[PDB]
Every structure is written in structure tokens, then in C-alpha cells.
Amino acid sequence: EYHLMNGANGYLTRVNGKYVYRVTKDPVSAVFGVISNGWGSAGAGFGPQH
Amino acid sequence: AEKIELSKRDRLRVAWRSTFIQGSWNYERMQNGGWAFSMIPAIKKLYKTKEDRSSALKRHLEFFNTHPYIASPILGVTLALEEERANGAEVDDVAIQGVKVGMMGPLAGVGDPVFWFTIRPMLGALGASLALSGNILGPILFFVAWNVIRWGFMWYTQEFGYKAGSKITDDLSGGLLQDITKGASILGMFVLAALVQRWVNIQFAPIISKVKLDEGAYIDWSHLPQGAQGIKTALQQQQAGLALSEIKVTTLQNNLDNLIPGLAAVALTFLCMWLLKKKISPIIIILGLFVVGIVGHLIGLL
Amino acid sequence: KIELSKRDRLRVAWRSTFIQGSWNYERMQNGGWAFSMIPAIKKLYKTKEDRSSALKRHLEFFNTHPYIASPILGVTLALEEERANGAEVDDVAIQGVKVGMMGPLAGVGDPVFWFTIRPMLGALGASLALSGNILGPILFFVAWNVIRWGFMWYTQEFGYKAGSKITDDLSGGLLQDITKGASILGMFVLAALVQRWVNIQFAPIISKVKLDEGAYIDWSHLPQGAQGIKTALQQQQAGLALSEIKVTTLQNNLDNLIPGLAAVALTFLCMWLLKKKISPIIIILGLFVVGIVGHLIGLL
Amino acid sequence: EKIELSKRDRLRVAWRSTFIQGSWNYERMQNGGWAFSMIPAIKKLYKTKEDRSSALKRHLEFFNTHPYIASPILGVTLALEEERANGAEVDDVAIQGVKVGMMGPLAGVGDPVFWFTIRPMLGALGASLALSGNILGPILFFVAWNVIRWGFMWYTQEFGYKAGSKITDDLSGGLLQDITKGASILGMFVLAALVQRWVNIQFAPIISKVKLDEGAYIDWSHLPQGAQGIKTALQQQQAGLALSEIKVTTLQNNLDNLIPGLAAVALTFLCMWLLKKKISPIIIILGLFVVGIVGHLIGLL
Amino acid sequence: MSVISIILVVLIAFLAGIEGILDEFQFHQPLIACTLIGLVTGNLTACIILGGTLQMIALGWANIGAAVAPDAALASVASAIILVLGGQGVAGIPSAIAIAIPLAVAGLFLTMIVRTLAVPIVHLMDRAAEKGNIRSVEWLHISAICMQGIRIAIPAAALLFIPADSVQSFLEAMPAWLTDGMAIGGGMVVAVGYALVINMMATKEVWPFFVIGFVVAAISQLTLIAIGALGVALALIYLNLSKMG
Amino acid sequence: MSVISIILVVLIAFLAGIEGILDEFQFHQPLIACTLIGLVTGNLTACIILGGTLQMIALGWANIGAAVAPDAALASVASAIILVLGGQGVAGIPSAIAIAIPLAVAGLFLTMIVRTLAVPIVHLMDRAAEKGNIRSVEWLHISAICMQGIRIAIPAAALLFIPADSVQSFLEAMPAWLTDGMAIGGGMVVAVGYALVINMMATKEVWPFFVIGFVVAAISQLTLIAIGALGVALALIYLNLSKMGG
Amino acid sequence: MSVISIILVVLIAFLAGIEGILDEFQFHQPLIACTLIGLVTGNLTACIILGGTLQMIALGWANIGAAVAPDAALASVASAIILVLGGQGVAGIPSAIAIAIPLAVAGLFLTMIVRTLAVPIVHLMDRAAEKGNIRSVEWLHISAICMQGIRIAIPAAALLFIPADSVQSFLEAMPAWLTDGMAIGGGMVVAVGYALVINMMATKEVWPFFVIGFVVAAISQLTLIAIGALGVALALIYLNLSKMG
Ligand SMILES: OC[C@H]1O[C@H](O)[C@@H](O)[C@@H](O)[C@@H]1O
Ligand SMILES: OC[C@H]1O[C@H](O)[C@@H](O)[C@@H](O)[C@@H]1O
Ligand SMILES: OC[C@H]1O[C@H](O)[C@@H](O)[C@@H](O)[C@@H]1O
Known about the structure:
- The complex is a heteroheptamer, with 1 copy of chain A, 3 copies of chain B and 3 copies of chain E.
- Chain A is α+β, with helices and mostly antiparallel strands.
- Chain A has 1 helix and 3 strands, in the order βββα.
- Chain A is elongated.
- Chain B has a two-stranded antiparallel ribbon.
- In chain B, helix 5 runs antiparallel to helix 6.
- Chain F: It is a multi-pass membrane protein.
């Protein structure tokens, strides 16, 4: 129904109340996703920082 | 002999105390205890008799935020400017603050994806590939490589900022500071808008209409050919535009997306901006967001 | 000694809501202007000697956006109040100001009101209305009426306070940045509308081609029982054609250059015809005629 | 005694300038065409063979530029040579100086406007009608392209002949720098688009083949039977359910997840760096073929 | 169904007809006319959705200087009346829209008829102004407004009391050659108004923005509100950069 | 089990707690914390796979400018303690992971409280530096570091003196509508995270770029890298035009 | 099949070869070469569509300063000849395209060898110019043009005079490790020309437009004409804004 949380690979839900973690990404695919998200939000930096 | 030069030992202990730049992390003025902790040996060496150590500490106890690893260049520049200010009156508590605030932003912006989002994930994956097989070599290599890279970067950048001190300053004193600030603000707004649109997830549950579609506007599964050509017919009508079900369901999310996608996200972001401008703590806003999530799920809104 | 109190200006502004309604092809919006100036003519003039002349001068051609016409009314009222006291009869300054700010103000009001504010408010209201919420139409009506009345009253007060001095304000300044930003936004939105709101879809068929035996799904050697479904779906996702006969349309070939090419070509033809001093009624009737004949010959 | 290079000979030169290529070699590119175009001028201006050899050998050296924007250089050279013929102004370096001066910028402003701006639009417009069976497409393409080309050549040649030594002054920082800047902007835009779309370096290694949990694939073994099964599968796919139990991920997918056309721009930048090292494009093209063969051999491509 | 409901729907149709040419209160817009019709006829939520979808369709339908836009007020009123009369309150919205759209034959032409019949009204206004009769001018203006209102009121009243013999004429109009030809000709009559307003504003500096807006209007990823916001942002950036110079 | 192992585990937890805010030696990372706990408690090999899986999950979990990241240190220590307490060294890894991931509700807010309440520490630092005592600052910084280390030292010590199932049982005892509400509330904390920085920099001449960036974020054609490159190019063009006009 | 048709096809191939290097009349472009070949030997529309598809493929295929572009003229002429010879006037167009695309082997290398074979021609031209015999330099230029035409005229005649004959260029010329590698290497040879022309014009002021064009070229929603129009509009806006200072 809902994904309670998603890590670098896969995501976490509850099945019949029990918590399960399902991995749906290869380690190199997880690294690619992490790099893509990190460098796709890098532009939001460089700011005054207060 | 009266120029109180900073020896290699003093710079080395400044770099060593740089490891603790965090630890006294605050919200009102983040990362001040680390700056003072790093500057303590410098003030101890190049200031004496305790008549004005309060002034130097207060100067080095203001707001300062940046990436923990790429902060050594700022420290080297500040050490050079302070040792030059011990004899030559150049920084009247207005140049060092200016250079600090100038390099806080862009240096953090370049250090965040390089270290947290490029080096760290690759090193973690390399270590975990060995760790998944029960090999201590994985974690050992991860630790050693990360420590070597981080310490080497800090020492290299600190030493470079010491030599280039009082030279780097008169490169941002020109038209390179306003330009960098303006470009950074433009790029930051452009990317923050996309981040707000994409990464803020607000999906609305309520369903408005469950109407029955008119005849000829949907795939009538009762009259489909018996196999073989049935799939051909179904796929060709689907490609034409016919619906897959007799009942057409309309959702509030569909209407809000027809207006413009991400409207709820931008409205929530503007509300958060207003609440922060009203001097409300971010902890309160985060707890409130969790509470309204729970309530919205309870009432069927989300 | 004529005062023209705020009540009279309020009455004129209220009557300016009916600037249209007597809309005719010979002299558009000419009756509404006189209707709105009726109370000012009544108050300023007497004994019916110059009332006929006043109605004559205000019954000539005058066409502009209904909402941005309050500045013209205010400047006209200021001129009339000025010439009523002191006998500074002009009969050409009033015409000069009426025609000077009739074209540029229409061109700055048409995009902002008809093509920027109205579609935005309508989409905002329709988003809620499609969910069955009464707040959609209510918000649309309230916001539109508040904006329109506030703009009308503020601009009427502006045009009367300035007076003949507005000719300096005409050479802006603010009126030049507004006329440029509105021009940019209006060109953007009008291009989008021409792309999206003009339907010239053709339906002739260029050719019917039997594809080679590596392109269609070949619904004769397919598996059965939910295996055929999977095979067909994977083949379609790969890129194989649904049917062995490939049908190529003129519309598809035209969209290979840029979508909406016919729409922009037709709109440029319409601009060229309009610049030739051709009434839009003839162009609209001709458009209906060409649509009919294109349907007859199979082009449309 | 003035010769004056009558308009008929200028028309002949402009006509012969259509064959600026044809003797296109790798050593002195487009030089035989330059000499061939200059031949009538050498015939008229010079006589008795005592300096015809010198005039030819001077116009037989390196000359590389866009074929269409070469009429300005042709007219400037015509004016300079005509002026030198009557007045004893032997330079042998002023004409070479202006040739090298106009070699670079004129080619850089002519290549994107003609080959990568006018030609693709004209070709697309012609092909849209050609794809409909209407011969008006190719006819319009031919007529428009040739009219534009001949008009540009004649107008620019006449302008360059008129501004003999004033070419580098009447167009030095005005509508030359403006035309150069606009053409550079348009060419960079269109060339980036062409690099993205026209260069195919699609890799084909398989990163991983993972198995999905019992909430993702369509599960075509417990599907309903008959027309109901097709409906169920169709809406399950529309929901977002995976079509197969195995989720195959390739290197191309991961590369596109960063930005599509990454390999294309990387290869283009590598070619740029190689060219800046003074490596002839023939070696680069042969190397591209070699790496294509090898990459298919090792399965990388 | 009650006589009070009939009076109310006739009255709101008359108001929509007035506002079709007044263009001030927007009572002729579907978002208001459809909901007003539904409010006084019982079913209200079934008409608000119809008004919303019609308003989605009826965006960019402005009257620009003697270039009349199609189906100002008759589309909304007729669709709402048809929907309330025929049942299927929310299920019949596509049918109501499919009957409302081809009203360009009955919605665009008669407004031009009224606008060309208003010329003698203005002639008589000038004739009265010659004698100085102030009251006659306003009387003629009000009568012109009332005639414009009844132009829309009459078809609504015809629709309430259905002339079931009109089925003989529904398909009597020669099919395809007339009905579909007029339907496909009605989808391009907004081009005249768009061309006129583009002629109103055209300079060497704003044509590239027209090109940009035409290009970025590709198939269904950006809503009209997104395009409008993009245009506003581009205009603001251009004005700021112009001020910098 | 043994006492010396208990002090060793507590000390490892303290190191992980201080390095969860220090972020230098990565002693808080699962790859190191889980390995150290497995080494000091006996079974070491069975804890390396736990660290590997948790590090695979925990990539891209870094704090970015007052936007704290979940479960930096507490997840690894709690998972290792749970794994070693309940036996099944190689079979209990999935359960340890499924308990680690929802430990955000106990780690993120836990570090946020100490992070917020460190402000009076710096206030006292300023007050003591008003006179010029270096020792007071050098004492207060270390006390803050140790105080943040206690944040992870305490729950790890408490897990060793509690039944080896309590946290798991508690986590699966939730009303099952609380989890959905928490999930849909955690998808909006990025809103306030971005609101802070938007308030940090926002001017009349950069809001149009916000509008343009919001509009061009349409559904699934342009990647985030492409949007960033577009923003950089637009910024460069704007700067060039501003300089040329001026 | 007629002698006149064969002669005219060979002549058209010769013209395509000449304009392949001349690049002035564009007789080498598919839109013209394919249409002329089709007009000469019966089926004209069938070749017109094929020329249209090839022109859609052959956009951005220009030679830039010793960076030759693939299949300037040989692909179009060979595809037209194979289409007219093999029947299937419109149905065989995808097959003709699939055979024309990997003819880069026969096109690029065959024009490169001719281009390096013209250096001795220019040496003879210099030798003749040294004697002052200006009547021979033009003859050598015409001979070079004629050989550039012949390099494409010959393969067309070879294709015409052989329906299938001995297919060894169809069997052994494709070891299935060389034909596919060469096919995938032929899809990147335009990168050398693109890199050269980008090197020709590149400043820190125009690189952001390169970034914008690269980004805005996402997967299959904007056509190339739209991208070019966007570039022209952006250039005009930039020039107008820069001239304000
Ligand atoms: O713009 C000219 C003006 O002409 C008429 O008065 C009406 O159609 C207005 O809506 C329009 O704005
Ligand atoms: O990016 C700014 C900087 O802020 C804080 O110091 C920490 O969260 C760092 O991890 C972060 O990099
Ligand atoms: O631009 C340099 C120029 O070099 C050669 O002459 C030809 O390839 C031309 O097409 C090219 O334009």
C-alpha cells in the first residue's frame, strides 16, 4: 500500500504487520541513483547559509 | 623576532583540532564551537597577556557553516590574515568576516556532492561488496581509504590556504564575490524549484466521480474476438484512445495535476517559509508535518 | 465653478460598466461612451444649447478594451471640467486624447485581461469545480469582479487627477515597461493558444504499406493462455508494429516538422488579411466556408 | 591602361566560383578551385606570360573556407589585384594577409548558418511534402536553396569588390561581430541538439537481472481466462506492474538516468581535444571505426 | 420543473445574454452560468462539474475588436439546460459537451445578427442627440442591452418547453456536408481574434518570444497555467535585464 | 554476555555517537560500527554481512545544511545488538534490517533534541569567553561532544539489559494506521528543509528563475542533472548580460 | 530496364558524384537524386517518399574541413536504384533504407581515397602553372571534378548491370563481426565534424547556449525545426539584450 521509507536500494513496508525490507536495485544501480540524486540537488547549494 | 610566526606545529594542531569542527552543532548559529576549538591554539600562540582574547574569541564565535572537510582553506586564510593582523593593521574585524561569509557558501556547495554523494557512496559500495561475503577487508579498506583521503585533503588545503593567504582575499574583493553570489542564488532558486516540485510527495486520496462511460468510449470485453485477434483488437482500441473499464474514476489529484503538477508541494513550502519567518522552530514544523500527515490519512484526505 | 464631486465620478464609473451593449459594426462602443458620460454632460452643461453638441462629440467612433477605458474617461472628464470653466473650447483636444490612448491601451489591456488574468482565474476555478466544489465559481467570480472594479475605479481616479498632464505620462516611463512586459507575456500566451486552441487536423491517407515480416506481432504464431498476452505486450514494448499494414497520414507528416504548423500558417494569413483592411466578419465567414469545402474535398 | 575588371569578367568569376571545390586535396585544400576561379582575372589583368606563372603560384597555396561565403574574399582579392596591376603596388603578402584574415571567421560563420541551419530546415520542409508523395517538396528545396546560394554569392562578391581595402573597416566590429555572435549562438544550440540526437553510442552490457517480489510482476499463471485476462493484464500494466518476473537493468539505462546522450557528448569532447592537439580528422575517423569494431568485438557496444 | 424554476432559468439565461456582450460580470462564462442553472433546478453538484469542464474548453474565447469568439453564452446555458432536462446528472456531461460545442452555428452567427441590428439603434441615438433628448439615448442603450439579453433568453425558453417536432430538423440539416463542415470550421474561428490581437502588439523585440511560446507548446506536458507562468517569468527577467543596461 | 563485552559494546556505542555528529572517521557508519560490535561481542563474521547490507541501504544518508539524515549511528548499533542478543547470527540479518530501517522515529528526533538543546552550551561559551578563559571553551566543546555521544551510548546500553524482542514487538504493535501517517508525513520534511534555504536567499530578481525551474519540472522527461545544467547555463547567461549592460 | 533509362540513371549518378564534392546545387542530396532516379525509370512517387525518408535521416551530414560526412551521395543513388530494380515501390522503402545506411563503407572511404588521390593532380597543376600554361590548370581541375563524379557513376552502373549475380559482397563482406562493428562505427563519424565545427566557434559567452541546446534535446517531444527556431529566437533575444548597453 505505502512505502514507509526508501534507502539507496529498495524500500521498507509492512506485510501482515511484520516489517519487511525489499531490495529492488543492484549495488551499482544504487550507487548510480545516489550519485544522480546528489548531483541533481547540488545546485540548491552554494547559497549564503544564513 | 617580534612577528610571532606560526610554526608547523601550530598549523598541525589547528588541523588536528579541525576534526572536531562539529560536535557543538547548534541551530541558532551552527558550527561555532568547532571554529573556536580550531582557533584556540592560534590565539594562544599569537595573542598573549589575555587583555583582548575575549575580542578575538567573539570574532571567531559568530555564525559559520560549511562542509566539515572543505573548511581547511578558510582556516589557512584566516590564520594568515590573523598573523598578518598581529603586526600590520589591515583587518579591522571587517575583512575576515567578509572572506569567511564569502567562502562559506560556494565551498559547502562544492563539497557536499563531492564527499557525501560521490566519494562516500562509491567507498561504501566497494566495502559492502567485500562485507557481503564476510570479509573484514571491506570495512578495513573503507575506513583506511576514507581517513587517508579526508586527512590528506584537509592538510593539503590548509597548507595551500596558509601560503595563498592575503592573496586569495584580493581575488574575492573584486567583482568575483558579487558575481558568484548572484549566480549561486539564481542556480539555487532554479534547482530548489525543481526539488520542491519533484521530491515533495503530496498525493490526495479522495475520489470525486465514478461515472459510467458512454457507449463506444470503452473496450467492450464481451464482444472481443475469441483469442488471437482478441489481443489485436484490444490493443488497437487502447491505442486509439478507448478506456479499459466502463466506470471512469476521477480523483482530486487528477484535477490538481490538470491545474499544474506540484501545486500542493509549492503551497506547503510557502506555508513553511511563512512559519519560519514567524520565528517558529524547524522542530515544531517537522513535528507538525508528521501530525498533519497522520490526521490527513485518518480523515481520508491522504 | 463646476465641482464634479466624487459622487458624480462614482456614478460615471458605475455607468462605464455598460460601455458595451450598444456594440455596432459601424461605430463600436460609441453608444456606451456617451451613456457613461451622460451624468457628467448633465451636470456640466445646461439649457440644452450645448448638450446636443456634447452628445455629438461623444457619439463618434471609440473602441478599446472595456476595462482599460477608465483612464480615457477620467482624462476626458478632466478636460471637460477644465473647459467648462474659463471657456477653453477645443473640440480637438478631446478627440486627440481619445484617439491617442485608444490603440496602445487596447493592446495592453487585451492580453492582460482576456488572455492572462481570465484564463488563469478560469483554470483555477475549474480545478475546484471539476471536484464539485462551489468555491471554484465563487472564487472566480469574486476575484474577477474585485480586480475589475478596483482597476476601473483606480484608473478613473488616475485619469481625472492627472488630466491633460497624462500626455507626459503617455510618454513613459511606467507606461513603456508595462506595454513591453505585457507585449512579451501576450506574445507568449497567444503563441501557446494558437498552437493549442486551433484545430486544423487533416484526414487524407498518403499510403497503406504492408510491413516486412519483422515488424508486426504476427498474431498467428503467438502462444496461448496468458503467454500470448505476455509475448504480445513485450513485442509491443520492444517497438514492433501492432498491425501488418502501416497507415501514413498527411497530418503525421506535417507534425514531423513541428506540431501546429497549419494553425500558425492560418493565423499569419489572417494577420496579413487584417492588415489589408478587411473586416473580420468576412474572414470568419470565409473560414467557415473553407472548412466546409475542405470537408467536401476530403482535405479536412 | 586601367583594365578596370568589367562586370562581365566579375560575373564569369562568380560563375566559376561554383567550382571552388572538385580539386579538393588534403595538402592544400580548396586551392585548385581558388586558382580556377581566379583564372579569368589572371587572363585579363596579366599578359605575355612573364607574370602569369607568379600570379598562379601566388593563388595556388592553402585556402580553406566555406564554399558559399568565399565570394567576399574573392571580391577583395579581385579589387586588390586590379589596384596592383595599375599603380605598381606589388605586395605578394597583402592579398595573402587578407586571405588568412578572412579564412577563419568567415568559415566559422558560414558552416553553421548554411550546413547546420538553412540546410536542415530546407531538407525537413522538402521531405515533409516528399513523404506525402508531393514532388513540390524536392522542387521547392532545390529552387530555394539555389536561389539563396547564388544570391548570397553574387551580393557578397559585389560588396567585397566595392570595399577593396575598406572591408576590414566597414565590417570590423559592427554587423560582423553581431552576425558572428548570433551565428555562434545559433550554431552552438543546433550543434548541441545534433550531438544529442545524431550520435548513437548506445552501449549493451547487462548490469544485473534481479528477481522481483510477489507484488510487481503480472504473474501470467494465475491470470483470469479469456477476454477478462487481457483486460486484467492491460490494467495491471497501466498501474505500473512489471511485465516480467526478472527486472533486467543495462548500463545504458543507468547512463540515461544521469542525462541522455552522455556518451555522445563525451565522445564529442574527446574528438575536440584530439583535434586541438593538431591531429588530422582522417586519423580520428579511422580510429572511430576501429573502436566501433573493437567495442562490438568485446561486447561493450 | 416547477414554474418558479422555469422563471429562474429564463432569468439567468437573460443575465448570461446581457453579460455575453457586457463582458463585465462574467455571468456568461460556463463556470458561473452552469452552476447558476444547476442551483435553481435542484441538481447542483452535477452542474458545477459540467461548468468546470466547459470552462476548461472555453478558455481563450475572448472577443477581440469585431472578431467575435464562438459560443459566448449559449453554449453554457444550453449544455446546462440539456443536462438537467435529460437526467444522467454527472454521467451525461460528455453528451452535454458534445451538444454544446457545435452550437457555434447557433451561438456565433446570431450575436453578429444582433450586433449588425444595433446599428439603427445607434443611428436613432444620434438622431435623438441632435434634439438634445438625454433620456432617449439611455433608453436606446438599455433597449439594445435588453435585445442582446433576449437573444440568449429565447433559445433557452425554447429548450425548456421542448418542441419535440425538432427531431424532424435535428437530422434534416444535411449531414457531413453541413454539420461536420461547420463543426470543423468552428474550431479555427479563434484564429481571427488571435491574429488581430497579435497585430495589436508586434515589434522586432517580441517576435522571438512568440517563437519560444509556439515551440514550448508541445504535446501535453505543460499546462496552460505553466505556460502563462513561464511567460510572466520571462517577461520579468527581460525587463530586469533591460533595466540593467 | 560477559561483562567486559558489555563495557566494550558501550564504548563502541559512545564512539559511534560522537562520530555521528563529528562525521570524520566514519565510526558511526554501519560498515564500521557493526563490524566493531561483532568483533567485541564474540561472533564477528555473522555481523559483517549485517554491516554490508546496512551500508548498502544507508548510502546517501548525509546531513546537508541543517537537514539531518536518518539513523546515522543508532541504527547500526541497535541492529548489531539485536542480532547478537537473539542468536541466529546469519539468519536474523533480515529481521535486524527490518528493525533498523524504521528506527528513524527513534534516531532522527533523538539527535534533533540534543542538536537543538546545544544552543545554551554555546551561550555559556560566549558568556565565559567574554572574560577570555580558553579553558572554558575547550571544556564546553568536549562536554558537548560527550553529551552527543551519550545520546547513542544510553539506548545501546539499555538494549543489553532488556528482552531481545521488545523493540521488535513494539514496532509491530503500532496501530498500522500510524505507520501510513508517518510515511506520508515524512515525505514533506524536505518542504521545510528547502523552505529554510529559500528564506536564506530570495530576491525580487531571482523569483522568476524559481518560476521557470518549477515549470520545467514536468513529468519524467528531464533528469535532475539536466535541470541543474540548465540552471547553471541560465545563471551564466544572466551574469554575462548583466555585466555587458553595466 | 530500357537503354535510355539506364543511360539517364548513369548520368544522374555522375551528376550526384560531382555535386557530392561541389556541394553547390545539392544534386547529391537524397531529395533530388532519389527523385530524379525515380522520374527517369518509371516509379516517381515511390522514389519521392524514399528520398523524403533518406533526407530525414541525412540531416546534419555535412563535411567540415577535412572531416568528411558519411554517405553524401552514394547512399541515395544506390537506394533509389535498388528500390526501382527490386520492385515493391513503397513497401520496399524500409529495406532500401536498411541497405543504404551501412553503405558508409562504400561511400566515406571511396571519397577519401579520391580526395587523397587529387594531391598529384594539384602537383601537376603547380607544375603547369610554373610554365605559365594556364590552359592546363583548368583542364586538371575539370579532370578532378570528373573523377569525383566517376567515383559514384561507376557503382551505379555496376548495380544496374547485376541483379544478383555472384553475391560474395553479400556473403563474405559481412563476417558478422566486421559489418556490425562498421555499422556502429558509422553512427559516430559525424562527431568528428561536429567537434571540428564546435572548435571553430567556441567562447565562454556561447557555451551556456550549447548546454541549453544539449539539455533541451530530450527524448522525442521537440522536432529539429522546433529546436532550430528556439535557437534563432534565443540568439535574437540575446543580441537585443546585449545591444541595450
Ligand atoms: O480590443 C478591442 C476591444 O474591442 C471590443 O470592444 C471588444 O471585443 C473588446 O473585448 C476588445 O478588447
Ligand atoms: O552542507 C553544509 C554542511 O552543514 C553541516 O555542517 C553538516 O550537515 C554538513 O554535513 C553539511 O555539508
Ligand atoms: O568549413 C571549412 C570547409 O572545408 C571544406 O572546404 C569543406 O568541407 C566545407 O564544407 C567546409 O565548410
